[PDB]
Amino acid sequence: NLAPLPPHVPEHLVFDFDMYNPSNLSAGVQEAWAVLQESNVPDLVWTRCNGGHWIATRGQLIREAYEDYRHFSSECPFIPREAGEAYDFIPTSMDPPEQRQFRALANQVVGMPVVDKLENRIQELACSLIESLRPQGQCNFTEDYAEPFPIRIFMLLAGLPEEDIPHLKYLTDQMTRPDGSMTFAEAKEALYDYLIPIIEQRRQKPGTDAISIVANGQVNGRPITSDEAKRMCGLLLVVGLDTVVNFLSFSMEFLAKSPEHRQELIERPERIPAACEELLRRFSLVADGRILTSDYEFHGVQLKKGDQILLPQMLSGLDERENACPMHVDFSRQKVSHTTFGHGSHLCLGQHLARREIIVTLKEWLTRIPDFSIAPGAQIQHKSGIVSGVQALPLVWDPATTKAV
Numbered sequence: 001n002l003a004p005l006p007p008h009v010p011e012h013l014v015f016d017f018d019m020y021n022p023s024n025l026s027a028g029v030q031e032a033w034a035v036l037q038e039s040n041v042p043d044l045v046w047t048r049c050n051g052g053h054w055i056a057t058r059g060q061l062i063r064e065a066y067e068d069y070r071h072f073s074s075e076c077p078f079i080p081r082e083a084g085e086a087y088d089f090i091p092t093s094m095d096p097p098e099q100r101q102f103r104a105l106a107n108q109v110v111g112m113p114v115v116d117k118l119e120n121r122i123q124e125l126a127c128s129l130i131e132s133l134r135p136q137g138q139c140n141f142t143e144d145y146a147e148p149f150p151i152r153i154f155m156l157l158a159g160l161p162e163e164d165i166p167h168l169k170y171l172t173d174q175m176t177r178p179d180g181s182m183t184f185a186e187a188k189e190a191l192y193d194y195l196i197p198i199i200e201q202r203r204q205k206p207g208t209d210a211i212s213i214v215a216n217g218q219v220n221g222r223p224i225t226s227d228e229a230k231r232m233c234g235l236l237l238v239v240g241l242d243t244v245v246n247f248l249s250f251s252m253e254f255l256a257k258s259p260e261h262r263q264e265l266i267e268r269p270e271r272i273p274a275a276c277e278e279l280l281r282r283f284s285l286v287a288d289g290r291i292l293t294s295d296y297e298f299h300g301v302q303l304k305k306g307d308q309i310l311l312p313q314m315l316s317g318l319d320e321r322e323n324a325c326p327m328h329v330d331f332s333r334q335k336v337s338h339t340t341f342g343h344g345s346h347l348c349l350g351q352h353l354a355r356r357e358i359i360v361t362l363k364e365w366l367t368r369i370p371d372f373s374i375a376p377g378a379q380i381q382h383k384s385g386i387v388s389g390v391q392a393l394p395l396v397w398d399p400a401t402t403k404a405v
């Protein structure tokens with residue numbers, strides 16, 4: 001359904017892109033979004049889909065808008081508007097200066113220092129999961145590895161039982177790729193219904209888990225409030241259950257379809273880190289945005305106070321203006337440019353944990369299962385939203401070609 005065109009939006013800037021069900025989704029989600037970068041498409045367009053909103057299509061504008069928080073506010077970061085209005089997670093729903101004090105505490109529970117403490121656990125789980133699958137000669141990658149690996153590690157640090165995964169995963173997914181059964185607001189309240197008692201429980205009897213640290217934390221010298229802690233932990237759950245999980249599947253789908261690249265990493269393991277960065281660019285998957293704090297002329301386009309603008313983190317690296325032959329994957333690419341982990345004051349705090357999980361996966365999987373492919377006749381389906389993903393990824397391989405170690 002298309003919303004009536006606002007009086008200030010000129011017809012020549014209309015491009016009805018649906019971020020939750022893009023026209024060319026069958027060609028791959030990144031490819032579907034890339035249509036926004038075709039020759040005849042303006043740098044900034046307006047779509048009448050999902051209530052109506054602007055979409056910056058080039059890395060230059062995306063980066064600029066993310067840096068200018070005075071005009072582009074995070075107060076309402078999601079499309080549709082009802083979702084952005086209900087969205088109140090900390091620190092993502094705040095703009096500087098207020099945002100910074102909470103960011104410092106968040107970095108404390110998901111930052112590099114935390115990764116170091118989880119290193120052995122992360123390594124051990126990846127190897128354990130892969131070894132268990134190796135002899136089967138097949139797997140449903142999304143549910144057999146992409147989900148359990150990142151999620152179990154997260155539940156470990158958050159001190160939450162693994163049996164709670166199904167429910168929490170469902171809720172998080174409704175906030176990024178809603179199936180229609182729940183509005184963002186309904187999913188949020190369900191998430192908070194789960195968290196509130198745990199936070200109070202851990203404020204009374206503090207543990208060493210991430211929820212306890214946040215719950216009993218301080219924000220620039222003063223005690224964090226119960227609601228602030230709740231809004232912070234809400235973000236942690238979403239990010240721990242619906243980010244790396246999706247990216248791993250895009251990366252493995254690609255490797256399953258390209259023996260050449262698998263071979264390159266097998267022969268030269270030292271290239272894994274660089275490969276991780278090139279895959280992060282090519283298979284970027286996030287797209288959220290901002291709301292205009294006032295009327296503002298941006299790159300020749302008149303934006304009105306309250307207008308929502310989608311700033312696809314995914315598009316910057318796919319922009320041929322930033323990377324030549326953007327759809328081509330080259331692990332030796334000289335200057336890999338992207339905004340996969342965001343840009344500006346809200347730059348991803350968990351990117352170190354994400355990269356570690358990606359690199360460990362690449363290394364340990366290729367060491368045990370060097371040769372694999374997409375299951376016979378399988379047609380991989382992608383899903384689009386605030387965070388895009390892969391519906392299912394059935395893989396097959398000959399056990400005789402694997403190495404247990």
Ligand code: HEM
Pocket residue numbers: 074077090091092093103106110154235236239240243244247285286288289313340341342343345346347348349350351353354
């Ligand atoms: C492939 C994996 C990941 C991607 C692509 C990703 C992407 C992003 C992006 C684009 C933002 C900024 C959004 C905005 O500007 O509104 C962000 C923020 C954040 N991310 Fe990540 N993320 C990933 C994994 C993680 C993980 C594993 C954690 C921790 C468990 C994490 C924690 C955070 C936090 C706390 C913020 C909010 C920072 C702030 O608002 O100041 N991220 N991430």
Ligand SMILES: CC1(C)[C@@H]2CC[C@@]1(C)C(=O)C2
Pocket residue numbers: 089092176238239243286287288386387
């Ligand atoms: C857009 C994001 C990827 C960023 C981290 C999780 C996410 C869905 C948010 O709500 C903020």
Ligand SMILES: [K+]
Pocket residue numbers: 075076077084085086087088093
């Ligand atoms: K809001």
